């Protein structure tokens, strides 16, 4: 959460719950073109098809691009962009590790940006 | 949460597959016997995105098997405690809620869910509800919750959640 | 503990373990039930192949809710108020829908309180007219109560400080974003409101006319662009999204499309790649592995349970849609359309016709198909539970055979383990037992001989053989001619196997070996079927471990417990239970929990209080005072609660309620009380002395009710006290005999079935045995020792079968591998 609890995940880039969805269905179309998949893969594919707010390679790529410009924690880069808060205060209430870091006007601006990409 | 990490595994390949498609057999066995396994140090693994390289394969002395060390970039789901996640509740009980954060099974106690919520049995989606039915948590509701306890059982991971905070309700 | 409270209070026991507490009604609600219940049950046709009664449901709910009569006490002793139409099972159906009606009001009462607190918030400041209160009052189904609730949550769901007068955890739909950007007006300035489109649909013509706005959509779109929404095409998308969603959560729109899915909805199935291989002829998914344009009304009894069962494992992917594969969108796009050929009308009709289709494709087609799937599945789950109830009905609708001493032959496969048998008393307890351990064929003649020597000592009135293999078919003759030197019956052992593994029997029979404990129950089953089932199937795991259907694991378990426990409570009260027998014999202790009024608690309590007295039931009045049990529960229990009269009112051993004892004496006084105790007991001396009609208008005057066919009972009760109406014990036809031994059924005696087989010996054509043990004759027309050998297993399809000869003819020919 606020501190990273284990020691290995830091040098491991985090994926959005829509980028996961697009590359998992890429694995799907890879599979039926040529064994059958696990319950964990299919159940995760369903779960990330529920909460997939972006549907186009350009849109996910753009959201990645903006969040790379905005200089924030790599854990928080996806924990907002696949959660999509509306108010800055809800982003602060859900994330105890982003309070005291950012000013609220540009917060609402970039939240409007990620909502604009949808 | 949904990480894209690099981790390593070892393939004990049997001498039947020492033909032209040896490396393909190494890849196929990696995809087979790691995908879906829940290593509690590294959470669940969803799908192996790619393989960096297949190492040098040492013949095990006296056993015939070749132990190929493979390193691979794979999707991983990890439940760090004290996290807000997008559950999908599936089974309601007197003790609380049993929900499914994806691959993962999670449990929420009756005193880790708010006191104004009380168990209403006998409704055909038996659900916890307020006194005047403000919002109801029946089967298949996208509740958000704070996972606060995480237990590893070497088969799956069972997380323990709570709704004692702001913004922890149905969506 | 509550186990004291159930024992303490004077309600019927199952009224108290009902999840909703039972409460009385006020004759208006009790009318609001019986017209709803007669609508939602008993009249609406199922979507699968499976008037004056409202007064009877009105009456029945009077006994249950107000006067607290349980279903046994209503279906036998108040038949005038319910019969002809309401059978004993329909009284069980009505009591289950009172449970569903109560949940509907309990949720509506909680939902009226929620809307009025919103009007308490809104009038303190869209329009919550009384129509929003009206449809909430006019809710008839729980499905409609969800359309209203979702409709209310769409608009006024974003109103939290109604509770202020732990925040909300805001929504995830894009609607909240667009309405934050104030695109409501551009949604409003579409040519109609969602509600008036709903009036178009249910009337199927343009009753409300679209209010065209004299502008271009794009030039109106410039007013609403923002930082949140640049690009005035994106405020077209942001507007058509609201129009679709406001159409979606509009109940008048959602109801009418629901009733289209009831009638015109098609089931198309395709298999997965994993289902293109695992599906074969033996798999249950053969009959529907591919389907196109199957209307859901063309579904048959449990077809849809299996389809969603195959979809659950991953074999099939299916969809339910209204259009064929003249679409229904084409039907209803006219209802939101201006025929005026002006250009600005055309883009407004363009935007209108592409907002209405997003409502269909994105919102309604998803939610209505899922809802229809759950409703079809709930039909198919109900058919199985009805089928699992008809089978328990048949196993209990068999009369005890003609105190009966019965010996029961039980065998397993007879190699390294012997055949056992156990004798039983005339009242159910064990008497003696024996072993029958069947060259050494000549030693079987020694075992045949000792059967007569034992039955000459104690005399069975019938011997019963546990059909466990096909080996039973000849064992029948063995003991049959032992007798030729008293009958023989082939009695199945499916609960006897359970009786073995039951820990309850091991308390009864510790030293007795397994097949001996099985051998007890068949002599107990033929002694009386009901008494054994109540004993062995006295726990949840026990009763479900029997097999009533293949699919019975896939229906709602606790529902299946109720529809099986109601069949016990049906039969036990019809039969009646003799109490003072059950204090002595523990084998009959499990019967009394199925009497109305009693149950798991008062049943154990009544027998224990008698053990405090260590006395015998002589009269039903002994129960009310000397067993101090309340007159409300006494009015349920005593009408079915036998007392042996040869142990004192003789009417205590009859199907005559204690309260109607006096009218029973006037049936005997006018046969000319204490002198009349035995008068019609000893003969039904003449049945025409009793003027049954003339008593009825006298019963209209005093007694205060139409007791017309109550008299017809008491007249027939004096004739024969507890005449058992169970069908007399027949012997199995060869169909049952074929099905008992082979452990499989005419849906697995499929003619065309590729089966495993075993050739064991040839004595003309090739003769083979199945693993079931039947004889499989390979026809000479399909026949050579070299072509088919001896000792092996070969894939074989059946062209001809029977049930009496155990012939299971094979082919071995690869030209039979199609059709």
Swiss-Prot record, chain C:
It is found in: Nucleus. The modification N6-acetyllysine is found at residue 386. Ubiquitously expressed. Transmembrane segments: none annotated. Interacts with RNA polymerase II and the DRB sensitivity-inducing factor complex (DSIF complex), which is composed of SUPT5H and SUPT4H1. Interacts with KDM6A. Interacts (via SH2 domain) with SETD1A. Interacts (via SH2 domain) with POLR2A phosphorylated at 'Ser-2'. Interacts with IWS1, AICDA and PAAF1. Interacts with histone H2B and H3. Interacts with WDR43. Belongs to the SPT6 family. This is Transcription elongation factor SPT6. It comes from Homo sapiens. The chain holds residues 284 to 1288 of 1726 of the full protein.
């Amino acid at each position: 959460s606020q501190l990273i609890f284990p020691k290995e995940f830091e040098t491991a880039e985090t994926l959005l719950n829509s980028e996961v969805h697009m590359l998992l269905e890429h694995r799907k179309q890879q599979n039926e073109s040529a064994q059958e998949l696990s319950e964990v893969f299919m159940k995760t594919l369903n779960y990330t098809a529920r909460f997939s707010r972006f549907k186009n390679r350009e849109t996910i790529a753009s959201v990645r691009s903006l969040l790379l410009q905005k200089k924030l924690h790599k854990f928080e880069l996806a924990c907002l962009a696949n959660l999509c808060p509306e108010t800055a205060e809800e982003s602060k209430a859900l994330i105890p590790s982003l309070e005291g870091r950012f000013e609220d006007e540009e917060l609402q601006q970039i939240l409007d940006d990620i909502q604009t990409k949808r | 949460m949904f990480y894209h990490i690099s981790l390593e595994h070892e393939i004990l390949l049997h001498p039947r597959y020492f033909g032209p498609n040896l490396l393909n057999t190494v890849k196929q066995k990696l995809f087979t016997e790691v995908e879906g396994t829940c290593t509690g140090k590294y959470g669940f693994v969803i799908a192996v995105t790619t393989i960096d390289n297949i190492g040098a394969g040492v013949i095990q002395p006296g056993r015939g098997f070749v132990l190929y060390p493979v390193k691979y970039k794979a999707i991983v789901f990890r439940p760090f405690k004290g996290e807000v996640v997008d559950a999908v509740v599936t089974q309601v009980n007197k003790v609380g809620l049993f929900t499914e954060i994806g691959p993962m099974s999670c449990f929420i106690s009756r005193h880790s869910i708010p006191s104004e919520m009380e168990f209403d049995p006998n409704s055909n989606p038996p659900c916890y509800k307020t006194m005047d039915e403000d919002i109801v948590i029946q089967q298949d509701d996208e509740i958000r919750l704070k996972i606060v306890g995480t237990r590893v059982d070497k088969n799956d991971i069972f997380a323990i959640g709570s709704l004692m905070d702001d913004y922890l309700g149905l969506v | 503990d509550q186990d004291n409270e159930i024992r303490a209070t004077d309600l019927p026991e199952r009224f108290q373990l009902r999840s909703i507490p039972v409460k009385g009604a006020e004759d208006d609600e009790l009318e609001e039930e019986a017209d709803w219940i007669y609508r939602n049950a008993f009249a609406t046709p199922t979507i699968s192949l499976q008037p004056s009664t409202i007064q009877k449901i009105k009456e029945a709910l009077g006994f249950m809710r107000n006067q607290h009569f349980e279903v046994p006490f209503i279906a036998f002793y108040r038949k005038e108020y319910v019969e002809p139409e309401l059978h004993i099972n329909d009284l069980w159906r009505v009591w289950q829908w009172d449970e569903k009606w109560t949940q509907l009001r309990i949720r509506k009462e909680n939902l009226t309180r929620l809307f009025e607190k919103m009007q308490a918030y809104q009038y303190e400041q869209r329009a919550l007219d009384t129509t929003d209160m009206e449809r909430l009052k006019d809710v008839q189904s729980m499905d409609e109560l969800k359309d209203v609730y979702n409709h209310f949550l769409l608009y006024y769901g974003r109103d939290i400080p109604k509770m202020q007068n732990l925040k909300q955890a805001s929504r995830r739909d894009m609607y909240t974003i667009c309405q934050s950007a104030g695109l409501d007006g551009l949604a409003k300035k579409f040519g109609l409101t969602p509600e008036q489109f709903g009036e178009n649909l249910r009337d199927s013509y343009q009753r409300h006319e679209t209010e065209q706005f004299p502008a271009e959509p794009l030039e109106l779109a410039k007013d609403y662009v923002c930082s949140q929404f640049p690009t005035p095409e994106a405020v077209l998308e942001g507007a058509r999204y609201m129009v679709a969603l406001q159409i979606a959560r509009e109940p008048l729109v959602r109801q009418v499309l629901r009733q289209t899915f009831q009638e015109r909805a098609k089931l198309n199935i395709t298999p997965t790649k994993k289902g293109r291989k695992d599906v074969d002829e033996a798999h249950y998914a053969y009959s529907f592995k591919y389907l196109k344009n199957k209307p859901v009304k063309e579904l048959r009894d449990d077809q849809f349970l299996k389809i969603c069962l195959a979809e659950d494992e991953g074999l099939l992917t299916t969809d339910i849609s209204i259009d064929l594969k003249q679409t229904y969108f084409e039907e209803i796009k006219q209802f939101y359309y201006r025929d005026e050929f002006s250009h600005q009308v055309q883009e407004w009709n363009r935007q209108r016709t592409m907002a209405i289709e997003r409502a269909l494709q994105q919102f309604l087609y998803v939610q209505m198909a899922k809802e229809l799937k759950n409703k079809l599945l709930a039909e198919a789950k109900e058919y199985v539970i009805k089928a699992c109830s008809r089978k328990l009905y048949n196993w209990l609708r068999v009369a005890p055979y003609r105190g009966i001493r019965v010996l029961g032959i039980a065998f397993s496969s007879a190699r390294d383990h012997p055949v056992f048998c156990a004798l039983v008393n005339g009242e159910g307890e064990v008497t003696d037992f024996l072993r029958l351990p069947h060259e050494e064929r000549e030693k079987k003649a020694q075992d045949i001989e000792t059967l007569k020597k034992f039955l000459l000592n104690k005399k069975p009135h019938v011997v019963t053989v546990a059909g466990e293999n096909r080996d039973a078919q000849m064992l029948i003759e063995d003991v049959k001619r032992i007798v030729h030197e008293i009958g023989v019956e082939l009695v199945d052992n499916e609960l006897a196997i359970l009786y073995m593994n039951s820990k309850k029997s091991e308390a009864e029979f510790r030293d007795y070996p397994p097949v001996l404990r099985q051998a007890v129950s068949l002599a107990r089953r033929i002694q009386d079927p009901l008494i054994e089932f109540a004993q062995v199937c006295s726990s949840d795991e026990d009763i479900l471990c029997l097999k009533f259907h293949p699919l019975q694991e896939h229906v709602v378990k606790e529902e299946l417990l109720n529809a099986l426990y109601c069949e016990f409570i049906n039969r036990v009260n019809e039969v009646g239970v003799d109490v003072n027998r059950a204090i002595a014999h523990p084998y009959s202790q499990a019967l009394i929990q199925y009497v109305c009024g009693l149950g798991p608690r008062k049943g154990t309590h009544l027998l224990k209080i008698l053990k405090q007295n260590n006395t015998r039931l002589e009269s039903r009045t002994q129960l009310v005072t000397m067993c101090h049990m309340g007159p409300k529960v006494f009015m349920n229990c005593a009408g079915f609660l036998k007392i042996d009269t040869a142990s004192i009112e003789v009417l205590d051993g009859s199907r005559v309620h204690p309260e109607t004892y006096e009218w029973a004496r006037k049936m005997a006084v006018d046969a000319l009380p204490a002198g009349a105790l035995e008068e019609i007991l000893e003969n039904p001396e003449r049945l025409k002395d009793l003027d049954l009609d003339a008593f009825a208008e006298e019963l209209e005057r005093q007694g205060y009710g139409d007791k017309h066919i109550t008299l017809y009972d008491i007249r027939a009760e004096l004739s024969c006290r507890y005449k058992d109406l169970r069908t007399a014990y027949r012997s199995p036809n060869t169909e049952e005999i074929f099905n008992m031994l082979t452990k499989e059924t005419p849906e697995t005696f499929y003619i065309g079935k590729l089966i495993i087989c075993n050739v064991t010996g040839i004595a003309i054509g090739v003769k083979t045995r199945l693993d079931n043990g039947v004889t499989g004759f390979i026809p000479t027309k399909f026949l050579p020792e070299e072509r088919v050998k001896v000792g092996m297993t070969v894939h074989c399809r059946i062209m001809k079968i029977d049930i009496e000869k155990f012939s299971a003819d094979l082919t071995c020919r690869t030209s039979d591998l199609m059709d």
